[PDB]
Amino acid sequence: PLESQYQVGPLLGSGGFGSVYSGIRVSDNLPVAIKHVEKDRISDWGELPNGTRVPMEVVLLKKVSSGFSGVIRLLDWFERPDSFVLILERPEPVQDLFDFITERGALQEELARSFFWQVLEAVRHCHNCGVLHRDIKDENILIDLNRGELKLIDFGSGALLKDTVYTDFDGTRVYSPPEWIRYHRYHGRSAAVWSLGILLYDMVCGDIPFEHDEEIIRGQVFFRQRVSSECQHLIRWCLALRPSDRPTFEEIQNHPWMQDVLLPQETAEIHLH
Ligand SMILES: FC(F)(F)c1cccc(-c2nnc3ccc(NC4CCCCC4)nn23)c1
Q: Which of 59, 92, 125 is the last residue of a domain?
A: 92
Resolution, Å (one decimal): 2.0
Asked whether residue 72 falls in the same domain as residue 196, the answer is: no
Asked whether residue 13 falls in the same domain as residue 107, the answer is: no
Residue 195 annotated as binding?
A: no
3-state secondary structure 163-224: CCCECCCCCCHHHCCHHHHHHCCECHHHHHHHHHHHHHHHHHHCCCCCCCHHHHHHCCCCCC
Number of domains comprising the chain: 2
* 75, 135, 153, 222 from 126: Cα distances, Å: 18, 13, 12, 31
Q: Which of 64, 92, 120 is the last residue of a domain?
A: 92
Which CATH number do you get for residue 179?
1.10.510.10
Catalytic residues: 135
Phi/psi zone of residue 184: left (φ > 0), alpha (ψ -120 to 50 degrees), beta? left
Asked whether residue 147 falls in the same domain as residue 256, the answer is: yes
- Let me know how long the chain is: 273
Q: Does the C-beta of 252 come closer than 6 Å to ligand 1?
A: no
Which CATH number do you get for residue 36?
3.30.200.20
Name 170's Cβ contacts closer than 8 Å, sequence gap at least 6: 43, 44, 134, 157
Method used to obtain the model: X-ray
Asked whether residue 197 falls in the same domain as residue 107, the answer is: yes
Burial zone of 162 (CB within 10 Å; 0-12 exposed, 13-18 middle, 19+ buried): exposed
> What is the rounded CA–CA span in Å between residue 61 and residue 133?
10
Mutate to test the pocket of ligand 1, among 12, 72, 89, 98 (most ligand atoms within 8 A of CB): 12
Domain of residue 80, residue span: 1-92
Q: Which of 58, 92, 126 is the last residue of a domain?
A: 92
Asked whether residue 79 falls in the same domain as residue 106, the answer is: no
Q: Count the Cβ atoms, other than its own, within 10 Å of residue 166.
A: 18
- Residue whose C-alpha is closest to residue 74's, from 135, 192, 154: 154
> What is the rounded CA–CA span in Å between residue 254 and residue 207?
25
Q: Does the C-beta of 90 come closer than 6 Å to ligand 1?
A: yes
Residue 144 annotated as binding?
A: no
**One-letter amino acid for residue 57 of the chain:** E
